């Protein structure tokens, strides 16, 4: 009844999920014709089935989005009973408002496309902005890595009871005060005027930079420099989505991070060979459990 | 009231169209981010304007499509009066049916995406299947290269009154009979079974292979061989959309074509440097006219049989 399919070549997360559910990944032929068009071909009947498509990680965000939309549509017109998009890192999430510019709200565009493609349900993790659930009219389950992150901090940072959770920017305030409050410790915040300004106390204490995602890491690496300058004993960086593109990886080694922790919402195995301070939190069990619970009418909010 | 924007940095067609309309291309900040995400920023107000966005021919179809969708979205939420997508070569057009398989109808998906992004109108040329117009509820103007192709044939092939128009496959039948009937000449059809068969006489005549598009060119190259074997004097290939990916340019250089004729719905300039057989028909005037007619409420259908 449950059928799980994986996006293009990135399959490791998808395989882990299927394993936990006692399933094999559904048969599908996903490629790219010589002329760049995405080719998809569902290799088995999905009629009457509860279908979950786990987004890919072939890096190329537009190819991965189109492959997902095409797979959703194929399953819908092949009479699946329901189609859920499992998208650990939601594409174009940062493009979720105009920001005083004549800009697209591409996150809303992405939501409309998923909907017209035929998605009945979305499962995702740590939306850049919670309001993004409002971009849909279908149910969205937005899972949190927070519980996983707290666990990791307690278990890996000896001085954690007196650390400071630090936001790399002004916009990250809510996220870090949330974490600092759960741990009952201090928080502080960095803002780029450029020069960086720090508000809050970090002197002589472990500093943990926490962010929903890191891309070029230019901001997170500068922040690390600032924190050292302000006398933080040691600096960590905790990111739920480790995009790590461009100079990211070399900026990290080249930085003072005692470690950089991310989830496997994005494949990491390649960059871990090029960066020793990277540790990953496996979130396949959360995702698998969201799917089973989604399938069984069981509570998903428990995992929050 | 009229504002024309180009996708990407492959603005040659876009600039040719703007030029013909007496306009500059609208200002857009259009970059791909670190993590592959497309960035777009409309650099001027489009409020109350009749906006036309011309699809870029970069090559990476998924990037070009998303860029277009994002530009449509930006203009719509910036209160343009109307947004028309000008898509010279329609993406995923060859994915317009199931073909007895558990396949997506990706062309219908593309139409839905264009529609939800907010397109009010589509202008395109030579849809792979005319039924694709039915994939929308908004109006689509599907322009034809045929008038420009007929003119090219009459002005470049001495023996056109005695030639045969040839379809490279079963699905191109109507397209070639249409041309053959207008020229008042014969037609022929190739069908691939791992072998080609030809129905229709081409012996001791010039043969013109006509198709909507050529991609890797395996088919037209094999078709030309076949036609020469059947006694054609020589072989031309005329396509509206020259995708020419993979080994196409190599295949063409080795093929027994006298010439391969395409339109500029897809950029050809770089391809031509490596392939002297390619000749290009400029369709910018046809597109510019469809846009001008559309803005003015004048007849676009005039263009279906007449070269502006």
Numbering used by the authors:
A (entry chain A): 3 to 195, 203 to 313
B (entry chain B): 3 to 195, 203 to 317
Task: Show the paper's wording.
PRPP is formed from ATP and D-ribose-5-phosphate (R5P) by the phosphoribosyl pyrophosphate synthetases (PRSs). The human PRS family, which has 3 isoforms (hPRS1, hPRS2 and hPRS3), belongs to the class I PRSs that requires divalent metal ions such as Mg2+ as the activator, inorganic phosphate ion for activity, and ATP or dATP as the diphosphoryl donor. Due to the important role of PRPP in the nucleotide metabolic process, the stability of PRPP content is essential for cell physiology and is predominantly controlled by hPRS1, the ubiquitously expressed human PRPP synthetase. Mutations in hPRS1 affect vital cell functions and are related to many diseases and disorders.
2− complex was determined using the MR method to 2.0 Å resolution. More information about the 2.0 Å resolution structure could be found in the supplementary materials (S1). 2− complex structure, the β9–10 strands from Arg196 to Val202, with missing electron density, are possibly structurally and functionally similar to the same region in the Thermoplasma volcanium PRS-R5P complex. We also found that the highly conserved residues Lys194 and Arg196 (located between the β9–10 strands) exist among all 3 classes of PRS. The second motif with conformational change, termed as the flexible loop (from Ile89 to Ile107), exists among all known PRS structures. According to the crystallography symmetry operation, the PRS1 crystal structure appeared as a three-leaf clover like hexahydric ring that matched the apo state of the PRS1 3D-EM structure. We then reconstructed the 3D- EM structure of the PRS1 apo form, which displays the 3-leaf clover structure that matches the PRS1 hexamer model derived from the crystal structure, according to the crystallography symmetry operation. Based on the EM results and the crystal structure, the functional hexamer might be the most efficient functional form. The surfaces of active centers and interfaces are highly conserved according to our surface conservation analysis.
